[PDB]
């Protein structure tokens, strides 16, 4: 029940915003407020040709 990393730093008032490769998630949106997504970042599969 303790957040680390980006969400941990932002939730505990240690920072104002978290700029980076932050995937917007349901728990993350519940805990902190996210902005409008500026790029699509889904989950995908990488395989050898």
């Amino acid at each position: 029940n303790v957040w680390n990393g980006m969400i941990g730093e932002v939730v505990y008032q240690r920072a104002v915003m978290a700029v980076g490769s932050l995937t917007i998630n349901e728990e993350r949106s519940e805990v902190v407020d996210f902005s409008v997504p500026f790029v699509e970042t889904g989950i995908s599969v990488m395989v050898s040709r």
Binding site: I24, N25, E26, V39, E40
Partner: protein, 96 residues
């Protein structure tokens, strides 16, 4: 053939090309955006609707709607290989 090009949103053109096999989306994708549930400036559902739509995104709900409303198609004619010769093409040879 009254128009030469139609500028419009990717989902609509892709679905139309999937259904109407006489049209193609060809130009490169530009001005990336998204469809959003617009509401009043001060409406209490905003946080709740955002949470619900994101929950639908993360689980197996949105892709199901994509399969059942958009992804389904009858023909596409998408192939980078040179065109396969068809009967109506060299029918003149049979005429000779």
């Amino acid at each position: 053939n009254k128009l030469h090009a139609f500028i419009w949103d990717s989902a609509v053109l892709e679905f139309e090309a999937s259904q109407k096999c006489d049209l193609v989306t060809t130009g490169e994708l530009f001005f990336r955006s998204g469809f959003g549930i617009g509401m009043r400036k001060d409406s209490p559902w905003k946080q709740n609707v955002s949470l619900s739509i994101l929950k639908s995104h993360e689980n197996g709900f949105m892709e199901d709607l994509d399969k059942t409303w958009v992804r389904y198609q009858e023909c596409d004619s998408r192939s980078n290989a040179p065109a396969t010769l068809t009967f109506e093409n060299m029918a003149g040879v049979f005429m000779l």
